[PDB]
A = this chain, B = another copy of it.
């Protein structure tokens, strides 16, 4: 699982506006991965922008890691 988690974090960090992965929980559901993630974002981004970044992370991570079949992304302000 470490290898898949590393891939998830790297993919997320390369999305514009991500200020780190604060939390990542991944688990196997059969051979599929289901995951829950919290990203940091600029505290001065709007809520709408933060939700855009979260959606962009979901697209990037799911696009890169084919075994993921569920990914929920939320955001917190981070310096």
Contacts and interface: CB of A to CB of B under 8 A. Distances in A.
Interface of A: 3, 6, 66-67
Number of copies of this chain in the oligomer? 2
Contacts of A6: 66
Nearest to A6: B66
Contact of A66 (B3, B66, B67): B3
Contacts of A66: 3, 6
Contacts of A3: 66-67
Q: Name the residue in A6, A66, A67 with the highest tally of chain B Cβ atoms < 10 Å from its Cβ.
A: A66
A60 to B, nearest CB: 13
A26 B77 CA distance: 44
3 contacts: A3-B66, A3-B67, A6-B66
